[PDB]
Design brief:
Layout: H1 4-12, H2 15-28, H3 34-53, H4 64-76, H5 95-101, H6 118-125, H7 129-143, H8 149-165, H9 173-187, H10 190-199, H11 206-220, H12 226-242, H13 248-264, H14 266-269, H15 281-289, H16 313-319, H17 323-334, H18 341-356, H19 375-393, H20 397-412, H21 418-429, H22 431-434, H23 440-463, H24 469-475, H25 482-486, H26 516-519, H27 521-533, H28 545-558, H29 565-579
Helix pairs in contact: 1-3, 2-3, 2-7, 7-8, 8-9, 10-23, 11-12, 11-17, 11-18, 12-13, 17-18, 18-19, 19-23, 20-21, 20-27, 21-23, 21-27, 28-29
Bound molecules: octanoic acid (caprylic acid) (OCA) (3 copies).
One octanoic acid (caprylic acid) (OCA) binds near residues 389 and 428.
Amino acid sequence: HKSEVAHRFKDLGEENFKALVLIAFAQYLQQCPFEDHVKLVNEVTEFAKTCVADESAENCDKSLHTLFGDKLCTVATLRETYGEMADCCAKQEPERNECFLQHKDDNPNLPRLVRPEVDVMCTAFHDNEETFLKKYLYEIARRHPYFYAPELLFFAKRYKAAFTECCQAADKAACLLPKLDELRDEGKASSAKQRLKCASLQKFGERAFKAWAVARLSQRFPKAEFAEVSKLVTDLTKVHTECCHGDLLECADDRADLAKYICENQDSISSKLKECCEKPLLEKSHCIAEVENDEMPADLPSLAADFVESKDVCKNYAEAKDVFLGMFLYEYARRHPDYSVVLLLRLAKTYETTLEKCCAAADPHECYAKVFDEFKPLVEEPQNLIKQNCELFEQLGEYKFQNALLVRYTKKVPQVSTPTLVEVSRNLGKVGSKCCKHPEAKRMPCAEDYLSVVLNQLCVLHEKTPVSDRVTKCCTESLVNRRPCFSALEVDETYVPKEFNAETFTFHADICTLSEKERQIKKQTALVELVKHKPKATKEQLKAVMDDFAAFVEKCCKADDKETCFAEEGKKLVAASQAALG
Ligand SMILES: CCCCCCCC(=O)O
Ligand SMILES: CCCCCCCC(=O)O
Ligand SMILES: CCCCCCCC(=O)O
């Protein structure tokens, strides 16, 4: 009451409050030293403590955003570090906070993290334990500005547990790396997923996220009722709206209340929440988010009875045009848990479009009667793409699959920057190994729900510097139809070739000197540059010359002595390739 900061301090705590203010400061001022953030966080914590001590103290009844802005832009006084943000500290709410959000750079130019030796790491661990963790939050926060803040509190706890367990024992080295590598890969997949849920709210509206929540939650919690699912959807969309416009303190407090509410009414929602509701406070929210699908209730009546075979559908749509679509998306999703939540959204849009021209054109019950018959092509389009691409996967392997995708997507949009083309085709090829092990029933909810994440990275790294017109149209036209837009483009007849640059195909030394995971990029980028050299005369057997590149390495990889072999076979290879016209 009368003080939001005091209420947040009382609710969250003292250790969860200082952590959430370090994340908020680091996600806004990405290029700032650690000590500055520590000082600001300490000052904010002291101010909050004083406001808790006396509610009618010096001014602290102001909204959290106002205090954030006052400590952020009126105190930092660094304009050469962040250009044009000096003019940002000139407006009022809600203009200043909106201004701050466009400057969160998704791909900052910061040095890549290098992991020190285990001995030094655990030596520094048992000296300033309270600071060693605070450095972990700072780096992950600044490199991933849209990371899910209450989730990042969980990763810090797992990091601390991992350090406490292993190197306070024998075999310090080969205990930590197998565990820390699990968090690094799990931390780069929960940041791309949250970016998608957060770019669907500030670009496509709250009506787009609410439908996604209704479709997703109804799959995972059947045998519930629309009254319960609507409440859960409203609470969830309130939670996820606050983690996007920087209200981390209010986002972490609302998530805990939602988890508590779900655990209280466990029986009315799902029968698989017994285990997740007996965990600590930070682990309940993670367990509930990844709970498995509940068993479908038996004896569900066919959906055609009261959606196409009832003489009130037009009246029901006229009465309210979003609660009827909510019911259709809820009923068609609880009984189809083998569909991706983006395919279900597409069918709901098709039903709405059919009803729009049928509830206001002559006889209603003559044109929407066969609406369910036109759902078949939409259903069969992605399952014929998963069955084919995943068949291509288990005859080439991961590395050779990423190359096939790389050539396919370079000819579709031969104007995106090479680092983006390489980095998005490497992520696309990892869906072929992530869930091709699943049976056919579980393939679609995993593949198409992962591709939608990856393609999002192609759009948020392209909004900053729009170069290709096709990518702009596919990204900014519809959220659900973003994947069918991409997998429908033929080879671009425009984009006259890039001409010949000799220095690109001039591999000099190295290569067989560093890790396999990183030396692969230095060859995939060469392949990308090769494709953009001849977009049109690029028939499949021509890229067998790609194998020759490997050969050009192989010999010199074992003949590293007389390193001039790199140049010799390089000029030989480029002469032979140019003589081959492809
Ligand atoms: C407290 C965690 C909230 C879980 C409800 C649904 C989560 C999701 O589907 O993302
Ligand atoms: C692309 C959105 C399709 C579903 C519209 C209704 C959403 C809701 O239930 O609020
Ligand atoms: C099993 C993975 C299937 C999809 C791979 C990527 C298809 C595409 O977007 O062209």
